[PDB]
Amino acid sequence: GSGPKGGGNAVKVRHILCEKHGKIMEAMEKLKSGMRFNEVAAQYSEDKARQGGDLGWMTRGSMVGPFQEAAFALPVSGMDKPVFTDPPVKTKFGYHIIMVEGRK
């Protein structure tokens, strides 16, 4: 009884990857310290971006597999304090920080 919730097919996910695996934390700390949310998402994501790159509503079946198998299968999360798993998850490009926030 906490809001109209009886499906859960979309979630607000964001991603940040660090081929060097050195800024993944610099990206995990900044986001946790409240530093640059867009710059870190800009480069620390060594790819698209998590904050400003925050893709948006994403439903299973149109995402991929592993990237969705974790976040989706995992409760909301993101930043340096995601769900039980860890932000820097591996799937096919190193460890990326996935932040799901707003399921459907």
Side-chain angles (χ1 to χ4, degrees):
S2 47
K5 264 209 293 274
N9 244 121
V11 290
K12 211 50 136 282
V13 295
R14 306 192 201 159
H15 334 297
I16 249 156
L17 136 62
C18 311
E19 249 254 15
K20 307 200 196 238
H21 282 38
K23 61 257 233 126
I24 192 86
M25 234 265 58
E26 224 192 2
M28 229 196 262
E29 239 166 47
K30 302 264 256 226
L31 267 86
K32 132 175 242 198
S33 322
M35 215 98 61
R36 297 136 134 146
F37 266 121
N38 228 20
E39 116 149 3
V40 300
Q43 246 327 149
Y44 292 11
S45 72
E46 215 272 318
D47 73 348
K48 174 83 163 109
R50 200 140 174 245
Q51 281 68 87
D54 177 359
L55 273 68
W57 272 118
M58 266 288 148
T59 36
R60 206 264 240 142
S62 298
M63 230 200 262
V64 38
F67 207 99
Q68 173 278 109
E69 264 209 358
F72 222 84
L74 280 166
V76 160
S77 88
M79 206 222 63
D80 176 24
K81 191 234 229 247
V83 87
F84 300 102
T85 195
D86 316 292
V89 318
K90 177 168 144 161
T91 180
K92 57 129 84 148
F93 232 113
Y95 307 152
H96 40 108
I97 319 178
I98 279 168
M99 136 157 36
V100 160
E101 223 207 270
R103 202 127 69 111
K104 235 199 170 118

